[PDB]
Design a protein around this ligand. Sequence first.
Ligand SMILES: CNCc1cccc(-c2ccsc2)c1
Length: 188
Amino acid sequence: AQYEDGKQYTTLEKPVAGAPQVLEFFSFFCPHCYQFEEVLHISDNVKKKLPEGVKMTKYHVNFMGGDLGKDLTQAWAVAMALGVEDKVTVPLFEGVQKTQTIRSASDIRDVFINAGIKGEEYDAAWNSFVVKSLVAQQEKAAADVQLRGVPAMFVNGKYQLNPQGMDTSNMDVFVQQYADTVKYLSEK
Ligand SMILES: CNCc1cccc(-c2ccsc2)c1
């Protein structure tokens, strides 16, 4: 009774078939997601503790930030397609929430250019159907679980992380609790 359904995690009443093993959702507009990623480094510490053969997937969502939110989901598709997530995640979060210099799709593009992604490369990707397919994949995944809040993490389409059942007096402890819970669920 150390881990229990309803505490560190909840159980999906409609389990999602064929879902990624560990699926994280976020928005660059999401203040708690900024904390999760830039301050707590949740994705990294979770990934760091996944069993061998367990892949981690991270998807952007549309339902925050209106038009720009949709642009960001497309830009994240570009980031995934090019494999430059580790290059643009920080400046995208800071551009939206710290400096608030990201106000348009062009501003988003500037972040990729500054990170060394060539203009032609970004634009071809941005306009590609491979990227359209990746946008659709992100939307479908979020749709599969009736997603309406971020940050969120799901394990095997069956369990949903519940950070509200964790102590926050110490950041590092919270993070390891979160990561050990994901590991526990992935072995479940
Ligand atoms: C959805 N936000 C979850 C959460 C739960 C507990 C602590 C935090 C936190 C602690 C320092 S920054 C953000 C976030």
